[PDB]
Design a protein around this ligand. Structure first.
Ligand SMILES: *[C@@H]1O[C@H](CO)[C@@H](O[C@@H]2O[C@H](CO)[C@@H](O[C@@H]3O[C@H](CO[C@H]4O[C@H](CO)[C@@H](O)[C@H](O[C@H]5O[C@H](CO)[C@@H](O)[C@H](O)[C@@H]5O)[C@@H]4O)[C@@H](O)[C@H](O[C@H]4O[C@H](CO)[C@@H](O)[C@H](O)[C@@H]4O)[C@@H]3O)[C@H](O)[C@H]2NC(C)=O)[C@H](O)[C@H]1NC(C)=O
Ligand SMILES: *[C@@H]1O[C@H](CO)[C@@H](O[C@@H]2O[C@H](CO)[C@@H](O)[C@H](O)[C@H]2NC(C)=O)[C@H](O)[C@H]1NC(C)=O
Ligand SMILES: *[C@@H]1O[C@H](CO)[C@@H](O[C@@H]2O[C@H](CO)[C@@H](O)[C@H](O)[C@H]2NC(C)=O)[C@H](O)[C@H]1NC(C)=O
Ligand SMILES: *[C@@H]1O[C@H](CO)[C@@H](O[C@@H]2O[C@H](CO)[C@@H](O)[C@H](O)[C@H]2NC(C)=O)[C@H](O)[C@H]1NC(C)=O
Ligand SMILES: *[C@@H]1O[C@H](CO)[C@@H](O[C@@H]2O[C@H](CO)[C@@H](O)[C@H](O)[C@H]2NC(C)=O)[C@H](O)[C@H]1NC(C)=O
Ligand SMILES: *[C@@H]1O[C@H](CO)[C@@H](O)[C@H](O)[C@H]1NC(C)=O
Ligand SMILES: *[C@H]1O[C@H](CO)[C@@H](O)[C@H](O)[C@H]1NC(C)=O
Lengths: 482, 534
């Protein structure tokens, strides 16, 4: 027993406990189970948690697993009384909680699935800095009666508001900033939505689907890649903050949208002024003109030109934006670090090392997997190159050849062979032309001889008829004469 | 003695040597009469003959030949002096033999040479000075040899050379710009990578090379330029050829076309650009007013609609095999031929288009459509309010699938992890230059790259492509050869059937003589019967 169980009323805290000692630790509270209302395990080197070991505490209402080194699945579905679960700062990958969860703190994990058994209360879900890739990564229950949903710094591509319909009446805060979102879609009336944050994503079109957030007070599409705004959008008088800086708008749509949301234009101005200090955004190029408060431009066809530029990289004969890109990736890593800070807990030096031992065992293990995938890819290439040199004839190599050198020799040889083959074919086609000309010469001579024959055939017939007229005169005379 | 002696036989040619056969052992031969001066036939050829070596004896005894036709006589060697007495030869035909080399001064004495065909031999090089003495040379063919270079002095004295055929050798250098008299030339199917174009040539075919650079003086006469099947990557050079009527840039490596290199073309009618890598086209800034046929098919065109002012003016417009989303034609357009199949059409754009052009002007059609597309007017199209946004999203969704892809124990582990991190970096570096090259070869052969597939699969994509390509080329050649053999067969049968028609002509003359004898013999009998009747 190097571990300590502090009690304060009906809140218990366990310290200096480890994976091999935690089950003991919990058993020594079974006597007192009725009274364990909050249990706090934070700041230890725990890496697994036995839902079943905790099921005796049937009054357990808050469980704080924050800043341990939990990995893989964390399954607490079975804790049906559980209401607040804090597992900020771990490495969990899938997470399942039970029918009573009201607040779920899970920032700074490796989370990419979450299940929430069916239930009647609202839920506040906090998932900043994980690996969610799409809303359906949260199960149906996880998306019912959500009131606050923080998915900042995840890995989502596309939002489909329909998938949050079971929170039409509850959802008040939706944070999706710093993902990778390039399409949003779905019509749903979010009766309660106060704020929507799509800052730093990759959206190109604010479309009809944003009537879903017509009620908000606060909305950001800051730092996306917007060009067009759907004009049919009708925002409430409720709106106060409306940030669109860092896009690339075609003035056409600024004018068309302000025209029937006149209000929003002064709201736009007031937002940039609150945020930056002047009443218009600082366009990337001064030459560039605003409409109201946002930089804009009469653009021939912005979507087509973006698609053409992609298709050029795809199809270019050879294998700027590496500055737009690299500073976009630093922007992200500054937010992650910042956030890793905003959620940092206090931890003693001896448990840091206890923690770094388990964490380093996982890095080493992942690196072994990677170094060995590497080794496999390498032998596969060597194998393929050895099948290849067995099917053609390479020049003699004096020095040992690398795989780069082998691929160059192999393509080179096929190119020689192709050219040889083509040269052979040319000769054959030229031969056919020479013999065909010869055929026409011969077939001319064929008609010349056929016509001469036709004409001898005639001349024999003449000379015959003439021999016959003489034959008649001979037999007429001989009659007359003897 | 004069043991083996061959004599003429007037027929086109005024001298036709028959059944002559010389080989490599043959020592002494005699042509015509001994009195060289009776041999003054000017237009000589051979029939049923094969001369492994062309004997000095021939133009030793015949010094009055104008046109010498030695086509297809299995000649393998030319006697070092066969042409010493050939002062009068104007036209020399030696195609389709097996000549491996020309002796250095073999044409030092045929100074009235105007036409020379050496096509389809085994020449590997020309001797320095080979033509320094045939200033009158106007037509020269050496198509189908194994030549690697035509040195620059080769044609310094042939300042009338108008028609040059070098097609289908192994040429890596030949500077046509040094022969300013050229009127027609064909250096197709060689290994060229730069093409110098002389000042006044009017038709030039340099297709099937690897040309990436064109140079030479502005040339206003150049009318037909064939460059299909090359390594071209820009077109600015075109500015220098204001007189083109047709140019073929097919099967090159072009990525865009702009109007700038065409602004000086006063009469261009025909511009072929199929099978490049076009991702953009702007010919509307300044249209080419005279153009009639424009082939852009099999590229990667996406947005072409602003080219309306050029397209309206064409007769023949081939957009097939691209990703074109919209196209727009005036009611007054002049197209008679239009291809549209295999793109990525917007249904609204197709419907408005088919108000102004209909089949049979539209010459092609789709068969089956992907999941969200359906036929309008015979071509696949998807309904969409914003087609370009849609195509931009479609594309991004395909690529993002790929973009989603004792504390002594603690000190020993930090070490272990650093040593592994280094092995893993080294593994990437070591195979780097290789992955670069695999991508270069997929781009080169226009293979599509599966950013999922494991590396040995991309490497196999290249090899499978090359092997298929070899096989298909080989089968194709076999077919061509089967065709040549068959056609030689036909000519052998034809000549047999001509011999039989000639034997028949021979019999009929004999019958005519007989009948003519029988006629006089009766004319006689009837004269006798008349005297005996006083
Ligand atoms: C520079 O130098 C090169 C010499 O290397 C010249 O290149 C030659 O150019 C001509 C094109 O002008 C090529 O000939 C053409 O060949 C095509 C292809 O036909 C092939 O495939 C056909 C399609 O399936 C098939 O029909 C063919 O079969 C035919 O011919 C074979 C002969 O064996 C025979 O078996 C059949 O009876 C067929 O008839 C063949 O496999 C051909 O389609 C062209 O057809 C002729 O008839 C059409 C009818 O509409 C007519 O419009 C054409 O004008 C033509 O006369 C044509 O023959 C040729 O193959 C190339 N030769 C070589 C050696 O590569 C080049 O032209 C020179 N340049 C310049 C500028 O002069
Ligand atoms: C779980 O325990 C942690 C501490 O391990 C609590 O984190 C505190 O969080 C506040 C901000 O909420 C910070 O000011 C404190 O500094 C943190 N404490 C320490 C020691 O770092 C956390 O709030 C607990 N979670 C719940 C839900 O009660
Ligand atoms: C976070 O999650 C990913 C994937 O869920 C982890 O990588 C997987 O882990 C196992 C064990 O190393 C492997 O069999 C798979 O190859 C992995 N999948 C992928 C896509 O890599 C990863 O190790 C986790 N990160 C941390 C630090 O815990
Ligand atoms: C030359 O002319 C005569 C007359 O046509 C040929 O003799 C025959 O003519 C009679 C009368 O019509 C026929 O009965 C015979 O068929 C003919 N043939 C024979 C065999 O007598 C005569 O044969 C002619 N000679 C030739 C071969 O042209
Ligand atoms: C097509 O043209 C390009 C440009 O000349 C060739 O690429 C050059 O050739 C080699 C390496 O590929 C070197 O001489 C140069 O460094 C290359 N230049 C560039 C810009 O890549 C290319 O080889 C030609 N393609 C073919 C098939 O010949
Ligand atoms: C050519 O000469 C040889 C030998 O006499 C002969 O057998 C061959 O068929 C000849 N060709 C003709 C058509 O005379
Ligand atoms: C032009 O198109 C094709 C060949 O390019 C030809 O078959 C067609 O019949 C021609 N056009 C018309 C109006 O028929």
């Amino acid at each position: 027993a190097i571990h300590e169980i502090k009690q304060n009323g009906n809140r218990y805290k366990i310290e200096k406990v480890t994976d091999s000692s935690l089950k003991q630790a919990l058993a020594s509270l079974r006597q007192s189970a009725w009274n364990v209302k909050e249990l706090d395990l934070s700041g230890n080197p725990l890496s697994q948690i036995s839902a079943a070991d905790l099921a005796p505490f049937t009054k357990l209402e808050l469980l704080n697993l924050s800043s341990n080194v939990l990995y893989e699945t964390l399954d607490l579905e079975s804790l049906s009384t559980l209401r607040t679960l804090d597992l900020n700062n771990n490495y969990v990958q899938e997470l399942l909680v039970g029918p009573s969860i009201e607040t779920l703190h899970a920032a700074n994990n490796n989370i990419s699935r979450v299940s929430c058994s069916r239930g009647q209360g609202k839920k506040n879900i906090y998932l900043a800095n994980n690996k969610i890739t799409m809303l359906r990564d949260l199960d149906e229950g996880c998306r019912s009666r959500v009131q606050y949903l923080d998915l900042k710094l995840n890995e989502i591509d596309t939002v489909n508001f329909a998938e949050l319909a079971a929170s039409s009446d509850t959802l008040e805060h939706l944070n999706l900033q710093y993902n990778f979102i390039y399409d949003v879609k779905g019509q749903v009336v979010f009766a309660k939505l106060k704020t929507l944050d799509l800052s730093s994503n990759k959206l190109a079109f604010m479309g009809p689907e944003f009537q879903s957030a017509a009620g908000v007070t606060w909305i950001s599409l800051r730092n996306n890649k917007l060009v067009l705004i759907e004009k049919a959008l009708r925002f409430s008088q409720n709106l106060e903050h409306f940030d669109l800086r860092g896009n690339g708008f075609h003035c056409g749509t600024l004018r068309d949208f302000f025209s029937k949301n006149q209000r929003v234009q002064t709201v736009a101005k007031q937002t940039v002024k609150k945020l930056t200090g002047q009443n218009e955004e600082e366009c990337t190029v001064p030459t560039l003109g605003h409409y109201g408060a946002y930089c804009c431009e009469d653009l021939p066809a912005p979507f087509a030109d973006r698609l053409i530029a992609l298709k050029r990289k795809e199809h270019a004969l050879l294998s700027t934006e590496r500055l737009e890109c690299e500073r976009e990736n630093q922007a992200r890593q500054r937010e992650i670090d910042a956030l890793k800070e905003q959620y940092r807990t206090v931890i003693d030096q001896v448990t840091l090392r206890k923690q770094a031992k388990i964490t380093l065992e996982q890095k080493k293990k992942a690196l072994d997997e990677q170094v060995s995938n590497g080794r496999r890819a390498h032998a596969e290439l060597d194998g393929t190159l050895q099948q290849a040199v067995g099917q053609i004839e390479l020049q003699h190599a004096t020095e040992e050849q690398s795989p780069l050198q082998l691929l160059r020799a192999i393509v080179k040889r096929y190119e020689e062979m192709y050219v040889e083959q083509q040269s052979v074919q040319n000769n054959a086609i030229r031969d056919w032309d020479m013999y065909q000309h010869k055929e026409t010469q011969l077939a001319e001579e064929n008609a010349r001889l056929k016509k001469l024959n036709g004409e001898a055939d005639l001349a024999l017939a003449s000379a015959n008829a003439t021999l016959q007229e003489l034959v008649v005169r001979e037999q007429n005379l001989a009659s007359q004469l003897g | 003695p004069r043991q083996p002696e061959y004599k003429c036989i007037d027929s086109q040619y005024d001298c036709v040597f028959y059944d002559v056969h010389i080989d490599m052992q043959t020592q002494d031969v005699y042509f015509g009469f001994e009195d060289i001066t009776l041999n003054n036939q000017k237009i000589v050829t051979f029939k049923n003959s094969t001369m492994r070596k062309l004997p000095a004896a021939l133009l030793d005894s015949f010094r009055q030949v104008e046109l010498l036709n030695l086509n297809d006589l299995q000649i393998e060697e030319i006697d070092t002096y066969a042409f010493a007495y050939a002062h009068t030869i104007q036209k020399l035909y030696m195609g389709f033999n097996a000549i491996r080399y020309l002796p250095p001064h073999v044409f030092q004495n045929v100074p009235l040479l105007t036409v020379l065909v050496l096509e389809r031999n085994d020449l590997s090089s020309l001797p320095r000075g080979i033509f320094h003495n045939t200033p009158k040379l106007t037509t020269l063919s050496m198509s189908n040899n194994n030549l690697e270079r035509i040195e620059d002095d080769t044609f310094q004295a042939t300042t009338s050379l108008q028609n040059l055929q070098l097609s289908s050798n192994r040429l890596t250098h030949v500077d046509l710009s040094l022969i300013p008299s050229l009127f027609h030339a064909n250096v197709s199917y060689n290994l060229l990578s730069t093409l110098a174009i002389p000042i006044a040539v009017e038709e030039l075919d340099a297709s099937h090379n690897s040309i990436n650079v064109v140079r030479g003086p502005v040339n206003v006469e150049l009318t037909i330029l064939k460059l299909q099947h090359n390594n071209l990557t820009d077109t600015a050079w075109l500015l220098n050829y204001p007189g083109l009527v047709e140019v073929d840039l097919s099967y090159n490596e072009l990525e865009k076309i702009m109007y700038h290199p065409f602004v000086k073309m006063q009469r261009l009618e025909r511009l072929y650009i199929s099978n490049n890598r076009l991702v953009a086209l702007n010919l509307y800034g300044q249209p080419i007013p005279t153009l009639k046929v424009l082939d852009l098919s099999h590229n990667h065109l996406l947005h072409v609609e602003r080219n309306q002012p050029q397209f309206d003016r064409l007769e023949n417009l081939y957009l097939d095999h691209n990703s074109i989303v919209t196209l727009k034609l005036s009611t007054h357009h002049t197209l008679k031929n239009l291809t549209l199949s295999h793109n990525d059409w917007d249904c609204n754009s197709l419907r408005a288009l088919f108000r102004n052009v209909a089949r049979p002007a539209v010459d092609d059609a789709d068969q089956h459509c992907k999941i969200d597309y359906q036929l309008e007017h015979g071509l696949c199209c998807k309904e969409s309010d914003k087609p370009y946004l849609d195509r931009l999203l479609q594309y991004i969704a395909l690529t993002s699938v790929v973009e989603k892809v004792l504390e002594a124990e603690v000190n020993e582990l930090r070490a272990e992890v650093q040593q592994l991190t280094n092995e893993q970096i080294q593994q990437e570096q070591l195979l780097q230059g290789l992955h670069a090259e695999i991508d270069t070869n997929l781009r080169r052969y226009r293979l599509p790259k599966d950013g999922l597939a494991r590396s040995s699969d991309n490497l196999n994509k290249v090899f499978t492509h090359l092997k298929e390509r070899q096989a298909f080329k080989l089968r194709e050649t076999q077919a061509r050869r089967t065709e040549a053999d068959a056609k030689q067969k036909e000519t052998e049968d034809l000549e047999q059937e001509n011999i039989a028609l000639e034997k028949q002509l021979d019999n009929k003359r004999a019958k005519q003589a007989e009948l003519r004898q029988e006629t006089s013999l009766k004319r006689q009998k009837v004269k006798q019967l008349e005297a005996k009747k006083n």
